[PDB]
Design a protein around this ligand. Structure first.
Ligand SMILES: *[C@@H]1O[C@H](CO)[C@@H](O[C@@H]2O[C@H](CO)[C@@H](O[C@@H]3O[C@H](CO)[C@@H](O)[C@H](O)[C@@H]3O)[C@H](O)[C@H]2NC(C)=O)[C@H](O)[C@H]1NC(C)=O
Ligand SMILES: *[C@@H]1O[C@H](CO)[C@@H](O[C@@H]2O[C@H](CO)[C@@H](O[C@@H]3O[C@H](CO)[C@@H](O)[C@H](O)[C@@H]3O)[C@H](O)[C@H]2NC(C)=O)[C@H](O)[C@H]1NC(C)=O
Ligand SMILES: *[C@@H]1O[C@H](CO)[C@@H](O[C@@H]2O[C@H](CO)[C@@H](O[C@@H]3O[C@H](CO)[C@@H](O)[C@H](O)[C@@H]3O)[C@H](O)[C@H]2NC(C)=O)[C@H](O)[C@H]1NC(C)=O
Ligand SMILES: *[C@@H]1O[C@H](CO)[C@@H](O[C@@H]2O[C@H](CO)[C@@H](O)[C@H](O)[C@H]2NC(C)=O)[C@H](O)[C@H]1NC(C)=O
Length: 170
RNA sequence: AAAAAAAAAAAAAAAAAAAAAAAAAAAAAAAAAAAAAAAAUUUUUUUUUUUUUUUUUUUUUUUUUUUUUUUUUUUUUUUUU
């Protein structure tokens, strides 16, 4: 679709919505603030698609009202910012994150502290840098099953990465 | 009472010379010191600009294999009004 951007009460009224897809829908959406998905406060979403939406910036607490959201997609996007953990604020029971196909995703030791209940995490060709810092960004995470960091050309790695991750399988 | 000549001693003061020294100031010569400015041999460290080798990410180009839709060039055996 070709909607430029959403409004304050665009999705207001959906009290039972759980499957929402917005792939290749937004063209004027360059920066994601915490006033875009305010309409989905009462919507118990479970899946979310946001591929090909030309998303380049997300603000702190953007998905704060997405407490019941479990699956969200952010692949095939132009995200260029610093991950500090507050981008996933408000995610009570999150399942997995589609965060592949990007151009720059800087990671820090607190980039994933807020959400410790992840199951799958793929970072395919997102050009990740500066990961070998101690402690590892994945210290709070324990329930991951699939971890993909392929096609990223990691500069360095140390022992602190991927230690104690008992639940990993892939 | 006073005045003078040969001849021998002693006391105050002034101007001198020589010798034995001792202090203050001034000149060098040696043995050291503390430094603010200096140069010169050796081994290392930071930063800027660039050289060589190896491993990989993005994009572009060539060749080969395979798959899906359209323009279709044809057809053999039949059907057909
Ligand atoms: C959002 O919508 C898009 C478009 O429908 C969904 O894309 C689909 O994603 C799946 C899984 O990533 C793709 O399946 C995989 O395809 C690859 C080839 O690209 C294949 O090698 C794998 O084995 C697997 O079959 C699927 O092809 C793809 N479809 C399209 C049309 O792109 C996406 O999954 C949606 N996201 C969410 C969270 O709903
Ligand atoms: C959505 O994102 C915006 C942008 O970051 C957030 O605005 C920021 O909110 C914080 C917290 O209120 C502000 O910091 C503090 O605000 C209080 C307000 O009383 C003030 O007294 C403090 O001195 C301090 O400034 C911050 O200034 C503000 N920045 C901007 C540019 O608006 C907003 O809070 C976020 N909303 C949600 C629901 O996450
Ligand atoms: C979104 O949340 C992150 C936190 O996850 C915010 O980053 C935080 O920003 C503050 C303010 O700059 C930082 O405090 C100061 O940081 C400097 C270094 O930049 C440090 O020298 C100071 O002593 C002080 O701690 C804080 O460290 C930083 N935290 C992280 C984890 O990066 C970010 O500002 C928020 N953005 C918005 C728009 O609300
Ligand atoms: C990590 O995964 C485990 C296993 O799925 C979670 O343990 C389950 O948690 C749910 C909800 O709290 C309970 O209903 C189940 O009975 C638990 N199962 C077991 C075997 O313990 C655990 O909660 C997850 N951790 C986090 C932080 O989400």
């Amino acid at each position: 679709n070709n909607i430029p951007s959403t409004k304050s009460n665009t999705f207001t009224g959906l009290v039972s919505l759980k499957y929402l897809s917005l792939s290749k829908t937004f063209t004027s959406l360059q920066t994601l603030t915490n006033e875009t998905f305010v309409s989905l406060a009462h919507s118990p979403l479970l899946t979310l698609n946001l591929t090909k939406n030309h998303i380049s910036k997300i603000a702190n607490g953007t998905f704060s009202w997405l407490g019941q959201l479990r699956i969200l997609d952010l692949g095939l996007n132009e995200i260029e910012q610093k991950l500090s953990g507050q981008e996933w604020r408000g995610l009570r029971n999150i399942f997995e994150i589609y965060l592949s196909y990007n151009k720059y995703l800087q990671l820090s030791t607190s980039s994933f502290a807020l959400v410790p209940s992840l199951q799958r995490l793929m970072l395919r060709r997102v050009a990740l840098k500066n990961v070998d810092i101690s402690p590892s960004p994945f210290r709070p995470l324990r329930n991951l099953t699939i971890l993909d960091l392929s096609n990223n050309n990691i500069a360095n790695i140390n022992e602190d990465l991927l230690e104690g991750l008992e639940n990993l399988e892939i």
